[PDB]
Design a protein around this nucleic acid. Sequence first.
RNA 1: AAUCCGGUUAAUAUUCCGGAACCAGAAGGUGGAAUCACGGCAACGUAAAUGAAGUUGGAGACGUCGGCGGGAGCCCUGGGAAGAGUUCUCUUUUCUUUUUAACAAACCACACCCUGAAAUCGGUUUAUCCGGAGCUAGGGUAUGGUGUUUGGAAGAGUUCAGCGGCUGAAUCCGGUGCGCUCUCGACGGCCCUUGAAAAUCCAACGGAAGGUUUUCACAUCUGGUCGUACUCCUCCAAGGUGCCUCUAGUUGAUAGAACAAUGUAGAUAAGGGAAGUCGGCAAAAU
RNA 2: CCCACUGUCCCUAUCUACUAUCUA
Lengths: 98, 55, 22, 70, 70, 97
Amino acid sequence: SNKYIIDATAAVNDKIFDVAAFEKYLIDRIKVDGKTGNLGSSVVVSREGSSKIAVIAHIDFSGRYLKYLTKKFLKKHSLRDWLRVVSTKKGVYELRYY
Amino acid sequence: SAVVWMRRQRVLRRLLRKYRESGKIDKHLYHTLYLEAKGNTFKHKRALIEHIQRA
Amino acid sequence: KSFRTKQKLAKAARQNRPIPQW
Amino acid sequence: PRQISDIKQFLEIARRKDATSARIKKNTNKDVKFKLRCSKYLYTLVVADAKKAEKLRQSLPPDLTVTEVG
Amino acid sequence: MKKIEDDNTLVFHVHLKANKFTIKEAVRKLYSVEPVKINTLIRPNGTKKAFVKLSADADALDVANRIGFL
Amino acid sequence: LAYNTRSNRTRIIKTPGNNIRYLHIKKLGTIPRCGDTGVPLQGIPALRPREFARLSHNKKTVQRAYGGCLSANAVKDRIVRAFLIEEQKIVKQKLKQ
RNA sequence: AAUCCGGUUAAUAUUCCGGAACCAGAAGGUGGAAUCACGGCAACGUAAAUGAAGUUGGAGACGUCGGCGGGAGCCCUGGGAAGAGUUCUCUUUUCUUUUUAACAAACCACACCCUGAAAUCGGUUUAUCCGGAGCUAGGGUAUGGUGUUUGGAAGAGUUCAGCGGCUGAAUCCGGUGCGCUCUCGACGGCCCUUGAAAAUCCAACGGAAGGUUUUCACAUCUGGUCGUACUCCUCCAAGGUGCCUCUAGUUGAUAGAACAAUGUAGAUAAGGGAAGUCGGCAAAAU
RNA sequence: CCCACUGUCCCUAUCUACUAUCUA
């Protein structure tokens, strides 16, 4: 039902984060009902092109949850100083530098 | 105890009035049940339901 | 504060005025 | 402020000399609000279709100093 | 000066027995201008000060220049 | 106005500036009461004594004899009592004549 | 009799600026209404529908206490959104915010009326109160405490993003409770000494008088005098478990250096346990 | 009166802050 989009055009251009890395992180950290990989048919993650990550969910999926998941990878990469998560529009999150 | 008694009395009175309007209990039975319920005869709604079924 | 006390306070504050230098 | 729902009386109260200024509001709901300032009361009118809204723009007298969104 | 430039209101030191009615007629007869609102206060020294809000037809800045205190 | 009294009955309202302000609400009006019975009359809105002037003539009085000053039940009783007393005077006069 | 919101100062705001209302009084004018208006069994209703003298009625206008009901705000909290966190990992997580005024419109429920004649007593309060002086029930009438939908009104405010003042977005949906604060309604007591006055406004009876009236609508005008800065008996008063913390406000009260004796205060002490003193005074014991 | 208790006492000792002291 609802669609959530995470833009990674800047990350791909600056090589800070790759589409494969984002897809692997999303798959391994999607805590759908507390279980990784439990997205099922209600929620499906389908990233079209190597510039965005799209999730179509029939249930609630918090944008803060996506931001928190994105921040965990950013903290792991230790790139929080040069990369921050911003919300360009409702259901859309993008990464911005300083 | 006053808060519990106030809620219990209102619930019993509302249930008895609803039963009287539904035709389950006649006017005489409803009046007798209402008088009895004032002395906390039925401490639970199930007790009143059992009494109505036994009636 | 009436007009009277306003003028009385003004003249009270006009009494403790520094002397002209001429 | 009297909410006015009759276009014709909105027209006649505009022609009457008591009217001074008029404002047109375009909200997000694609509704047009006609606010007319009178001596004591601000009369408003909400219309929902643009073609009637535009037709009532040109139906307003030219002497009235109408203004667009604020 | 701020009120003259922004609020279009002149400021005078008026006679302590002058009310809003006489202040209006004094300004009209002395400066040939039209006040539309007058607000009077009494300063701590017991002297009346009156703010004379002029019309939109005239402006405070030119009238102040004509008086000579601009 | 220090030393708040019964006059300073303030109600807190939320302003459009996200601020809580107290608004002074005046005392509610009382409906007129019937002269004889003393019970309030029916059909008269309860407004302030000064605001009662603005209402129309028909909005303050009921369309009946002694309407707006005596209750309908009192009006019926007064009408009945007067007729019976008049009959007694007529009966007494005939007997005395 | 009658005002709110937003904005504004180095210092003043329900006063100033911008916007939006309200009251009182004054005349004519325009439209509408009656020839001293109709309808409903009734309670009563409506755009209007003259009322002298004289005679009344009502509001103002009235103790106190307790419980219940209603609403508002505040507090609590679920999401939604935004930002700021924390984050090897865990934590859809932590913190903060999420506005609608006066006023103006349409609609939204205990007292009475009509049918009715009741106990085999019914209705019913948290608290048994009423009923042939007319119950339950049915249909009405009025009073609208309120609530719904708007207008006011997003153009404002707030929060995020930017650009160079401008441009974007959001400002949402709930749930609630013996919660606190304020107010209203419906009761129940205690009264006893049965609970200020007047200004002011309205209505009734009455029938003088005769293009007239018109308590309907709309336009037009005006609102003087004085206080208003500031300082301070009384107002406003978060959360958690006598403490701790947030909001807010200070970090001042002449300072420094040394720590012997003295004095005050607070402690601990082997063995004995009131042998001390006129004396279990003070401590510890409990 | 009995029991318990303790620096009241034999018989005082130690520690802490303040005081006390000096300096401007």
